[PDB]
Amino acid sequence: GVQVETISPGDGRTFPKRGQTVVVHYTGMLEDGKKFDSSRDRNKPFKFMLGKQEVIRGWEEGVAQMSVGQRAKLTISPDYAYGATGHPPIIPPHATLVFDVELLKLE
């Protein structure tokens, strides 16, 4: 599944719902800390629609548990990420992923 650990608190009140668009900054890392992707490096927040299945399951279910303004560490099992096949060569088979996610706003 996905484990959500707070880095810094959000408002504690505004949680995203299915169909809403979330705006986030994120960094994705493998278990040894290697970064594989980051919106901060592009200086461009990332948007996705909750429930559209346009991101991996853990990032979706994890952000659903975040409030606006929160920054959190999401640890995601491979079955909630890229599974047995992965995303070669950047994501190996059966990889647990760690994302640092900041929920900036809902649209």
Author numbering: 1 to 107
Paper excerpt:
The binding of FKBP12 and rapamycin to mTOR (mammalian target of rapamycin) inhibits its role in regulating cell growth and cancer progression.
Taking advantage of the close structural similarity between the wild-type and the evolutionarily conservative C22V variant of FKBP12 and the increased stability of the cysteine residue-free variant, the G89P mutation was introduced into the C22V background for crystallization trials. Following refinement, the backbone ϕ and ψ torsion angles for Pro89 were found to be (−92 and −12) with the ϕ value being nearly 180° from that of Gly89 in the wild-type structure. Furthermore, this crystal structure adopted a cis-peptide conformation for the linkage between Pro88 and Pro89. The reorientation of the indole ring in the G89P crystal structure occluded much of the volume of the active-site cleft, conflicting with the binding geometry observed in the crystal structures of the FK506- and rapamycin-ligated proteins. During the later stages of refinement, dual conformers were allowed for both Trp59 and Glu60. The two perpendicular orientations of the Trp59 indole ring exhibited by the 1.20 Å resolution structure of the G89P variant reinforces the observation of a small difference in free energy for those two conformations in solution.
